[PDB]
Nucleic acid binder design. Structure first.
Ligand SMILES: O=c1ccn([C@H]2C[C@H](O)[C@@H](COP(=O)(O)NP(=O)(O)OP(=O)(O)O)O2)c(=O)[nH]1
Ligand SMILES: [Cl-]
Ligand SMILES: [Cl-]
Ligand SMILES: [Mg+2]
Ligand SMILES: [Mg+2]
Ligand code: NA
Ligand code: NA
Length: 326
DNA sequence: CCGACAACGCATCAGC
DNA sequence: GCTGATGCGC
DNA sequence: GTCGG
């Protein structure tokens, strides 16, 4: 965090292009730069020094110069002023509300926490639940609490079928001191890239996780992807823990490594590794890594048996989870 | 220059 | 209902 | 917004 001010400045600009400008590339551009500049082991002295890192070009170099000189960026002061942009940015914090729905609500005249609460009838299931736990979701989860949640999720899963193997991924597997949510990868010998010898494999787990009042709400639920809410149980006369976001992703057991790699992130690390895979000539997803022929079309899955195998295919030295946080 | 930028599950809606 | 585009969050 | 052919 030698450059917290700059990386923070960049993130804001990224969120602005995303939520307000709906310019998804300008968004990612800024994120990448914020990232590269965040791993940079030196306290940037000037824009020039930054334009050396890949991801920081001219435009971002100048802003960093403007920020180092005055401790701020005029382009952001302005945005912070513009009322329409400020509303859109705030509405985009309610889970389930993207740039489109925000700008939409603003037009309808809904632009504050209050407006949303008196118009609950205009929110879909996801947005509704998101507003419900607006505050809670703003809070981070301490690793200590992540460990507790992990026991529950794993012991319960073991309860449904000792065949289930549940791995907590995300910022947790990358060993963070806190997480924005909990991400769980689930496998079961019955479900492979070859056959689903059992249905409701995911359903079963969510059902058990709901019986013990661990899962409290649902944002979306598919045959292999659950997006919901959970809560650590409290003791007598003990203030309740905040409600937490939990993702559950069921992946074919023979494709675990590609799946664990994906769900371990970071999202930027994946975006980079997948970009680099495409240059090396391959394509990677949470399922498999396939080669690319001249036609461009993806080939057949390559034999993977370790996260490291994927790294090799693309000629990238293996990086530990902790070193994938970008 | 200028085309590309990671990849995909689930919810919601339009058009048939 | 089904397919495909768009939205939203991984 | 940045970058590699
Ligand atoms: O756009 C995305 C988002 C997420 N992911 C992967 C990486 C990420 O770590 C994982 C789970 O997503 P989260 O939103 O949970 N991010 P992460 O757990 O890394 O951080 P946080 O602590 O915010 O949850 O999914 C992508 O590949 N692309
Ligand atoms: Cl600023
Ligand atoms: Cl695939
Ligand atoms: Mg997470
Ligand atoms: Mg998540
Ligand atoms: Na650069
Ligand atoms: Na949002």
């Amino acid at each position: 965090t030698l450059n917290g001010g700059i990386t923070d400045m960049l993130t804001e600009l990224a969120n602005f292009e995303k939520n307000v400008s709906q310019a998804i590339h300008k968004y990612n551009a800024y994120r990448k730069a914020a990232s590269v500049i965040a791993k940079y082991p030196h306290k940037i002295k000037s824009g020039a020094e930054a334009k050396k890192l890949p991801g920081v070009g001219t435009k971002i170099a100048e802003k960093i110069d403007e920020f180092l000189a005055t401790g701020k960026l005029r382009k952001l002061e302005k945005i912070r002023q513009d009322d329409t942009s400020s509303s859109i940015n705030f509405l985009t914090r309610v889970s389930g509300i993207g740039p489109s729905a925000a700008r939409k609500f603003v037009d309808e005249g809904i632009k504050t926490l209050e407006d949303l609460r008196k118009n609950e009838d205009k929110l879909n299931h996801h947005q509704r639940i998101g507003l419900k736990y607006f505050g809670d979701f703003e809070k981070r989860i301490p690793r200590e609490e992540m460990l507790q949640m992990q026991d529950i999720v794993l012991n319960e899963v073991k309860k449904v079928d000792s065949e289930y193997i549940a791995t907590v991924c995300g910022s947790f597997r990358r060993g963070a001191e806190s997480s924005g949510d909990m991400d769980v990868l689930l496998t079961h010998p019955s479900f492979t890239s070859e056959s689903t010898k059992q249905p409701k494999l995911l359903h079963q787990v969510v059902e058990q996780l709901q019986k013990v009042h661990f899962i409290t709400d649902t944002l979306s639920k598919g045959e292999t992807k659950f997006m919901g809410v959970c809560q650590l149980p409290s003791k007598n006369d003990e203030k309740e823990y905040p409600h937490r976001r939990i993702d559950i992703r069921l992946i074919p057991k023979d494709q675990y490594y590609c799946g664990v790699l994906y769900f371990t992130g970071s999202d930027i690390f994946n975006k980079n590794m997948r970009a680099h895979a495409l240059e090396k000539g391959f394509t990677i997803n949470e399922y498999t890594i396939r080669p690319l022929g001249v036609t461009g079309v993806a080939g057949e899955p390559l034999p993977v048996d370790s996260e490291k195998d994927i790294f090799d295919y693309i000629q990238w030295k293996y990086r530990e989870p902790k070193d994938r946080s970008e």
